[PDB]
Amino acid sequence: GAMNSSNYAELFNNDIKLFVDDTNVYRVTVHKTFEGNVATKAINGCIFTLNPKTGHLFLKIIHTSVWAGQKRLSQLAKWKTAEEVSALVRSLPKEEQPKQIIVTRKAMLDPLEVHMLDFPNIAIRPTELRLPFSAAMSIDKLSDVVMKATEPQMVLFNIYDDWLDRISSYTAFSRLTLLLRALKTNEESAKMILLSDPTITIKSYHLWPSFTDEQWITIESQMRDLILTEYGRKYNV
Amino acid sequence: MNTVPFTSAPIEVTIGIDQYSFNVKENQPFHGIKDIPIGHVHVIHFQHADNSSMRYGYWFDCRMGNFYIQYDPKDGLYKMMEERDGAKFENIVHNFKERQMMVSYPKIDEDDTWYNLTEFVQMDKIRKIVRKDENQFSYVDSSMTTVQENELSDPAHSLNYTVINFKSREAIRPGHEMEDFLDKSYYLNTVMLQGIFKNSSNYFGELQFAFLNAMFFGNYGSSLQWHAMIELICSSATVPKHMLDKLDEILYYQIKTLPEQYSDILLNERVWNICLYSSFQKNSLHNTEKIMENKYPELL
Numbered sequence A: 001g002a003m004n005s006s007n008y009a010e011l012f013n014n015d016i017k018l019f020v021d022d023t024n025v026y027r028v029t030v031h032k033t034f035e036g037n038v039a040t041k042a043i044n045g046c047i048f049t050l051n052p053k054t055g056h057l058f059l060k061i062i063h064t065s066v067w068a069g070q071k072r073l074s075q076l077a078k079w080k081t082a083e084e085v086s087a088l089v090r091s092l093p094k095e096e097q098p099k100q101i102i103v104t105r106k107a108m109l110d111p112l113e114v115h116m117l118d119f120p121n122i123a124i125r126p127t128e129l130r131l132p133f134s135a136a137m138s139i140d141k142l143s144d145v146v147m148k149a150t151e152p153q154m155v156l157f158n159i160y161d162d163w164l165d166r167i168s169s170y171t172a173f174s175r176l177t178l179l180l181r182a183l184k185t186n187e188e189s190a191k192m193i194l195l196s197d198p199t200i201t202i203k204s205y206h207l208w209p210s211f212t213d214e215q216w217i218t219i220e221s222q223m224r225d226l227i228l229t230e231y232g233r234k235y236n237v
Numbered sequence B: 001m002n003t004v005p006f007t008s009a010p011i012e013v014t015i016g017i018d019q020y021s022f023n024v025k026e027n028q029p030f031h032g033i034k035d036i037p038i039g040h041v042h043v044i045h046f047q048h049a050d051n052s053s054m055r056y057g058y059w060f061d062c063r064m065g066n067f068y069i070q071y072d073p074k075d076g077l078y079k080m081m082e083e084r085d086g087a088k089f090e091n092i093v094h095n096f097k098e099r100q101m102m103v104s105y106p107k108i109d110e111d112d113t114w115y116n117l118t119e120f121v122q123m124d125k126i127r128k129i130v131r132k133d134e135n136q137f138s139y140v141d142s143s144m145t146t147v148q149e150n151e152l153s154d155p156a157h158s159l160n161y162t163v164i165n166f167k168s169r170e171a172i173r174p175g176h177e178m179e180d181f182l183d184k185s186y187y188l189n190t191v192m193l194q195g196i197f198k199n200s201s202n203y204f205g206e207l208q209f210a211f212l213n214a215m216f217f218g219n220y221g222s223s224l225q226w227h228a229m230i231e232l233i234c235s236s237a238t239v240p241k242h243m244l245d246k247l248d249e250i251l252y253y254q255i256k257t258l259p260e261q262y263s264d265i266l267l268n269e270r271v272w273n274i275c276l277y278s279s280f281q282k283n284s285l286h287n288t289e290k291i292m293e294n295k296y297p298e299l300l
């Protein structure tokens, strides 16, 4: 596929593509029953469908009712993801339909290919990058809307806020994946980095704080430090 | 009994007739094959000694005409032709000197293998897969692609097998994507059996033809077809009971006949492991599983 070795800039060209991450579709807590057994309880999840050029996030909330009465939920979850992604593509005008859909896990390929048979010219392929999209639910405003849903719901966000007014999609995506990787690696410290200045807030319609350009440079440095520090702690380097 | 006369054997060749094969040396006195049983189909196949590239051959039914082989020095192959003059053919074939220069079809009476391998194969259906209506016999070779392969380059020289594609609209009902992908019963029963093949005999006939083309010619598209048609049955939760029982017998005789040294190239490990050990019908293939395990354990 490649999508690396100086050929990953194409990600941000004018062919419409979507990343699909299913890691948060089927989510459960694990507890102990009365007799002593251990039981899962499902909690609401989401499909993370992202246009990396525009920052447009199609967050399909997966309400726990989806699972009721169903067997083999981890399998069903991939097929539920594919049904919803297919439904999304069909809902879009032709000029907004993706030319490529990049799934973050290879297990999504067959379910998506099968649901997308009506769109033979849409390429479906596995990502070559390790992407931290599983940490999407560490973004408070995303987690809040997922956990409050009482029914299936689609919520639209721009995961880049207003950054494209000032930086390129390539740069925005790098910032996004750095933030998410930090949230994945040390969520509580990454959140404190983002909240260190009480005078810098998150606009009602944004997900991230309103940092100036120089403040983003500092924040990014702190996130890189957080990630490297955790690497050292984990591998005793 | 019927006879397949050869005008001569100008080039050294390995000749197969049904499941048997023998060598002929260059310019050897050879005039063909005698003592062939009727009733079935047959296949005569060739692989030249000085160039084992291109195996090739002809499927034919002795009931449809008097057929003979003549080497064509322009095209460089043994060609099947039909003799319209039954009197000259009867005269060539009853000729005592002529049968001294032929080999006998060496059928052992106990052996029912060829019927077991070709039971459902019929010339009329072969001539729909191999399209050449001017001849009553059908040419196949090692290089010929299938129409399905071509859709992923000479349409006249293709194997027009029934397209089987698990990830296609034909196989998958809208609204039943997961169901139909995980359980191919719709695709097998409604699309293929009811819709295309009309009955399990025609289905098995193409399955058997594909296997034999894969084994006799090393034809890769035929191997793909054979495996696909097996996998479609095994991956269906709902299959008539006679079909599974009969499938076990069909596959058993195919695996039994397969050259032991041809296992790395004629058997797809993924498909066989799925059918025998993971599929809905894993337990419906008792005899096939037993011969596979005791003959090709390396593959499983």
Ligand SMILES: O=C(O)[C@H]1CS[C@H](c2cccnc2)N1
Residues within 6 Å of the ligand: B005, B006, B007, B008, B031, B068, B069, B083, B088, B089, B092
């Ligand atoms: O004309 C024919 O029908 C064919 C059939 S077989 C044959 C033939 C010719 C010369 C030597 N042996 C056999 N001639």
